[PDB]
From a paper:
The F-type ATP synthase (F1Fo-ATP synthase) is responsible for generating most of the cellular adenosine triphosphate (ATP) from adenosine diphosphate (ADP) and inorganic phosphate through rotary catalysis. In eukaryotes, ATP synthases are found in the inner mitochondrial membrane. The type III ATP synthase was detected in ciliates where it induces tubulation of the cristae membranes. In this study, we present the cryo-EM structures of the type III ATP synthase dimer and tetramer with associated lipids from the model organism [name] in complex with the natural inhibitor IF1.
Using masked refinements, the resolution of different regions reached 2.5–3.1 Å, allowing de novo modelling. Two copies of the ATP synthase dimer model were refined into the Fo-tetramer map generating a composite ATP synthase tetramer model. Both monomers are inhibited in the same rotary state by the natural inhibitor IF1. In our structure, the canonical inhibitory helix of IF1 is bound to the βDP-subunit of the F1-subcomplex. It is connected to the C-terminus dimerization domain through a flexible (unmodeled) linker. Subunit-b contributes its N-terminal helix to the peripheral stalk structure, in addition to the canonical C-terminal helix.
Numbering used by the authors:
A (entry chain E1): 374 to 496
B (entry chain d): 29 to 131
C (entry chain b): 27 to 61, 211 to 380
D (entry chain s): 115 to 145
E (entry chain i1): 28 to 63
F (entry chain A1): 34 to 545
Amino acid sequence: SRMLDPITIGEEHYTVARGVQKLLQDYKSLQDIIAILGVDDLSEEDKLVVARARKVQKFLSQPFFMSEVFSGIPGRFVNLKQNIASFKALLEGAGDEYPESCFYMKGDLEESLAAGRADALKS
Amino acid sequence: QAPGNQDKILKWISTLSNKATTGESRSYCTQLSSLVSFYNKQHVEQIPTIDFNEWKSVISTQGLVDKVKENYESLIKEQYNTDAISKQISSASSKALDDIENE
Amino acid sequence: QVAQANYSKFRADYSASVAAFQQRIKTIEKENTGSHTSYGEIRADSINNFLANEYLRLQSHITSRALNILKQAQAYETMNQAALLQKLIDDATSAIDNALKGDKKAEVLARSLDSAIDGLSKGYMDYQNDPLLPLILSSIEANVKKITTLSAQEQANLIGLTAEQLKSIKENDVRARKEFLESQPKLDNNLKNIESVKKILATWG
Amino acid sequence: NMAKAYVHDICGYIDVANKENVRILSKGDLI
Amino acid sequence: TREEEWLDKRTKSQEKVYFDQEDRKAMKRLLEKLNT
Amino acid sequence: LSTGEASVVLAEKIKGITQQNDITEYGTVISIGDGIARVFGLTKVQAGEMVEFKSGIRGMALNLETDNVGVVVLGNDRDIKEGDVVKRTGAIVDVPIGEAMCGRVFDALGNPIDGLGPLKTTQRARVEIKAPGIIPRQSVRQPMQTGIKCVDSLVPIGRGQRELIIGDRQTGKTAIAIDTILNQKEAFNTGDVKKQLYCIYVAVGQKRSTIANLVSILKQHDCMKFTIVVCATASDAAPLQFLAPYSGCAIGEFFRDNGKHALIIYDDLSKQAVAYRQMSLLLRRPPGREAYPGDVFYLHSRLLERAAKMNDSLGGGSLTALPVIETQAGDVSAYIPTNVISITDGQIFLETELFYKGIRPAINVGLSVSRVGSAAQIKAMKKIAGNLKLTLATYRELAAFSQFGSDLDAKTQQQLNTGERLVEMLKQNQYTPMKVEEQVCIIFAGVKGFLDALVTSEVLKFEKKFLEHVRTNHSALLKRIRDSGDLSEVDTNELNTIIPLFIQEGGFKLKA
Ligand SMILES: Nc1ncnc2c1ncn2[C@@H]1O[C@H](COP(=O)(O)OP(=O)(O)OP(=O)(O)O)[C@@H](O)[C@H]1O
Ligand SMILES: [Mg+2]
């Protein structure tokens, strides 16, 4: 997008977007080897990157209102502020402790944390 | 004036910073070094000479070039009075500083 | 020449500082009645160098302002002259357009027919007899004769610097002064919190 | 701590050239 | 998707480390030998 | 000159206006379609000659056949009809050249689309002319400062050479050219003619909105006063996109032949090739591989070979070209990219992976190269660039081992850290060109190993802070590096002393 620049949009918005792209690109550069052989021989920092990239890739997905009949779950509308905060906290490592399934088809980070916290609570 | 007149000014501050060990002492030395560099900042921009006749000749509004010249000339005369500043700074300065020097 | 004043002032501050051995004599006299050493030199030399380099910077600032004002004036004058000539050209174009209208356009078509028959009679066509060029020249010569009066009136006619035109230059000078003066030093930020420093900055002016 | 006293003193004598410029430049308006 | 570049980088890096150490050893041993 | 005297000269000039008309052979259009007109008659017409239709739009006579003539319409062909008249002007395609072009926006033919006013010029140059011979040229020995650290140090560009900015979409190709134009602005403001570089930007097959934003950016930085923009947008006819690069190059030859220096930036030449392919296929010419005509290589070569460094006998002028090439999926093995690489001197490869990993400008130093080499760089530059290149190669080699081996030696760890600091230093924002002398200081701090102290995340801000500190406190040093163009030993020592000192004073993260 041409609109993605520090002057047009907030500098915070730009840093978060670039961080996500850098995280995803780093993970994408490792998918071949991880496919051939597991992540065990992978470094500790690279394994953290892999875990965090899975979380973010899952969190990117969101249910739509028009797609409500297909999935059967209510759609979500995410304000820009909530979106940036969610991804900022995720890059910082807020939801790393929880499982990646809690981020699937969630509107905002708080929704994913509540589901993840309930899963931690159930056991 | 430009070269070599600031070397001694650096050795003095270097020793003073070497004496400082505590973080606060190191920070005070940083403040001191900033002040010294600010005062000793050299300026070299090749002040250009003005040919008022060339401007007066080529084109200008009647009386404008000469008025600019006389006003510019009047201001160039003014200059710092280093004598007055030197005496006050050499006479007395920061009695609190003098207290520190007593011991 | 400013460097000359720089070196002269430089020695003056040095001599005043050199006086400082005089104070020690005064102390000796007081002691007789009774019955870090480099800090002074570094401080003295720094202020002298500071004043010298600062004097040079101010000289550049004044000459630069004096030069920019005159250059900006010249640019405005060229624009004024260009606008006057552009007005002249627009009158010429309007004369052609008016000629396209009625009001003595018959001779133009008649003259064109004569010139056109000539061109047909010849291999090529040249507008030696077209009335458009003399017609345009007549208007332009009238305007030229009108402007050609004497250099005196041209002094203002050529360069009609409007009050707002000169006002803009004057506002730049005042703004330049405020920018040069209000420009405050940029040292360590969270370290210059002493009351005297903040006071000096607030009253920088 | 000696550096702290020196800093205060040296800072006391700042603004001299700035005030000098104010006078010299407030002297006349170039225009 | 480039596994060939991965192997090439891996190969180059490991060779450099091992043979950099060997170069250190070789300079020391020959220096000891050249001095006498 | 008095206003009255000037007006008299103007009146006299208006007086001496000549206008001759001669019998011009005309033909009829046998057919018209897709912008191609088959014309009957119109004999004694020269190949490449311009022709004029009834409405007033021009055409270029490319195909001379025994039966008819194949003309390409330089515009919209809706008004053209069978049996219409086609008048031969008698002159090969040409464009107005001069200094008044600067600060304007033209089309391929040279008509101004700014809306400011008519073009006040008297010189018209032929678009297609034989390139300079072997004798007129001269060795390239002057730097063309782009303002990009990575480029000015690793891939130096010399005035008179041809560098190819090749990459995929959205990799920062246009950004490099814009940054180059901005850097030139300082020289024009200061009265140093020996370094002024007129910038020409040829936009081929681009949405007018993009060019408008670019012109606004140039005006914002006041860099438009010395720039010329030639526009052949997507809506424009294919022949216009085909002639725009050649039109711009002729405008540059003006400066070249007149002892001046000009930088011409051809936006994607792949788009020019597409337009030429279209214009040729519609002419029924046999297609080559990927449907491109057989002589597409000749198209680009004849264009780019124009750029040269004329000898001192002719004025020492120079024309520097920065053609842009867009690749589909990073395959530089394609037909058009392959040809252009063989034509130019060096190529700057832009990679998408590097772009998203934070490496912006996304320049692949491993592939990028310049024939001129250090012959263009300044003395102070070459010294640092050699060590910088050697450091970069070592860092790339050890990157893979660290990820999997997960064990780092003291010597390797230092080299690994040093390379990382440099890569962070080479990063640069957009619309932020750096002076060459400031580059030397920053690159100096890097290669000497000082940057290894502070954390990587702080290297970029140290650059800004340290550059400001130098500009304020140490201005004579910068003037020496600039005027002399060399990094003396005294400057080395002075710089080597203040760098570590500043790192320790300012508030940074010192732990490596
Ligand atoms: N040095 C840079 N630093 C940060 N961002 C950059 C930098 N350079 C480019 N970008 C970003 O790259 C995008 C545009 O890249 P650019 O248009 O210059 O390359 P391009 O090859 O011309 O793309 P296209 O094929 O669409 O024309 C923008 O989003 C810009 O913000
Ligand atoms: Mg582009």
